Design a binder for this molecule. Structure first.
Ligand SMILES: *[C@@H]1O[C@H](CO)[C@@H](O)[C@H](O)[C@H]1NC(C)=O
Lengths: 44, 49, 48
């Protein structure tokens, strides 16, 4: 269970509407908002 | 992502091979559908490394 | 009288032109302007 998460949008930052689909192994989480995030989720 | 919606289909199956996709048949049942009206030009997978 | 004022409400804005026609039920929040000319457009009183 390594691959978890997706992003969608035109420029994928806070200037345009974007929708994000993620998972943290307790449920399913989806987000749709002007989210800007790094190219790689770093945890641990 | 069509007609102001976004449809998801999923299907899980375990494999004993490490080479490529298997020579089998499998349908994908719908999982969820939510109304969202933003055009998408690009996408990228996310990995929790 | 509900949405009318002597001063007026200038919040309501419309897009005169864009790069391409907006698709049905597609909302675009950026303020991009059509690059009609070879020079950048930028919506300035330059080259149309
Ligand atoms: C997983 O996502 C849910 C929904 O946002 C949250 O309640 C839960 O705490 C998350 N698990 C974590 C952060 O470990």
């Amino acid at each position: 269970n390594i691959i978890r998460g997706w992003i969608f949008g035109t420029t994928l930052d806070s200037k345009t509407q974007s929708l994000l689909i993620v998972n943290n192994a307790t449920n399913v989480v989806i987000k749709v908002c002007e989210f800007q995030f790094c190219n790689d989720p770093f945890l641990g | 992502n069509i007609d102001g919606y976004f449809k998801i289909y999923s299907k899980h199956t375990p494999i004993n091979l490490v080479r490529d996709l298997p020579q089998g048949f499998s349908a994908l049942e719908p999982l969820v559908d939510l109304p969202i009206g933003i055009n998408i030009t690009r996408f990228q997978t996310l990995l929790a490394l | 009288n509900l949405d009318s004022k002597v001063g007026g409400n200038y919040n309501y804005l419309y897009r005169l032109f864009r790069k391409s026609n907006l698709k049905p039920f597609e909302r675009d929040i950026s303020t991009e302007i059509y690059q009609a000319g070879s020079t950048p457009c930028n919506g300035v009183e330059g080259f149309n």
